[PDB]
Design a protein around this ligand. Structure first.
Ligand SMILES: Nc1nc2c(ncn2[C@@H]2O[C@H](COP(=O)(O)OP(=O)(O)OP(=O)(O)OP(=O)(O)OP(=O)(O)OC[C@H]3O[C@@H](n4cnc5c(N)ncnc54)[C@H](O)[C@@H]3O)[C@@H](O)[C@H]2O)c(=O)[nH]1
Ligand SMILES: [Mg+2]
Length: 217
């Protein structure tokens, strides 16, 4: 690939962005950058950013743009040499306009999944905090319940996956992030995939990406 790919994946919370991203990075030559993993890492490390982020995350509110754009642009500049997949940034118009001043996004993958469906999924979500690996009791279950397959350490549930917080996160997405979908639609780069199951969507995402980025061994 002479030109490195710059891809974004977007969708309402629980639509499967991180799940699809793990499949993409498994099959395609690109690096996955997750804002949420990055924020949850900053909370473990106790950074300035990590401390102030906790209050927003735990209430289902978007972290201020100034903080998030600086964090994301800084991380991206470490990845000039790779094709990358941005997962969870941008979430607002200022975040999307800033990203554009730095990079030319090739393609924005939009997962359109029912709110009722997604609401139920986040109820059953479990994660391994150190690695960020994601599990569900129905769809991607561990071999033992509540225990990561490898470290054997407790898998946990995000504090933001409580039903009251899920409602708040969905409304924030509707109010602040959907305008970003329209921004990328008018720029000619939005590719939307609708479904209720990741496994019914993945074939189309897979075929679509074959047309944009090399495959991985
Ligand atoms: N039954 C079934 N299950 C399936 C299926 N497919 C997948 N699943 C399962 O469904 C569950 C959800 O799948 P997932 O892949 O992990 O979902 P996802 O779409 O990535 O959801 P989230 O992580 O919740 O995205 P979201 O936008 O809320 O979070 P995040 O970036 O973490 O942001 C979190 C907070 O951090 C801050 N934040 C994060 N980014 C910010 C930004 N750019 N600006 C400002 N703030 C930002 C904000 O406060 C935000 O609320 C998993 O258990 C998975 O196993 C299926 O087909 N069937
Ligand atoms: Mg995620």
């Amino acid at each position: 690939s002479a030109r490195l790919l710059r891809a974004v994946i977007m969708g309402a919370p629980g639509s499967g962005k991180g799940t699809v991203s793990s499949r993409i990075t498994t099959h395609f030559e690109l690096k996955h950058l997750s804002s949420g993993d990055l924020l949850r890492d900053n909370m473990l490390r106790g950074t300035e950013i990590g401390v102030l982020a906790k209050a927003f995350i735990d209430q289902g509110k978007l972290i201020p743009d100034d903080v998030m754009t600086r964090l994301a642009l800084h991380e991206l500049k470490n990845l000039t040499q790779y094709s990358w997949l941005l997962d969870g940034f941008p979430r607002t118009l200022p975040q999307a306009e800033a990203l554009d001043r730095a990079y030319q996004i090739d393609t924005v993958i939009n997962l359109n999944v029912p709110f009722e469906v997604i609401k139920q999924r986040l109820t059953a979500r479990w994660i391994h905090p150190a690695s960020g690996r994601v599990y569900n009791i129905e769809f991607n279950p561990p071999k033992t319940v509540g225990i990561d397959d490898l470290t054997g350490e407790p898998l946990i549930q995000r504090e933001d996956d409580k039903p009251e917080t899920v409602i708040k996160r969905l409304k924030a997405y509707e109010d602040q992030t959907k305008p970003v979908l329209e921004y990328y639609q008018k720029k000619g780069v939005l590719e939307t995939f609708s479904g209720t199951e990741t496994n019914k969507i993945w074939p189309y995402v897979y075929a679509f990406l074959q047309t944009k980025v090399p495959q991985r061994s």
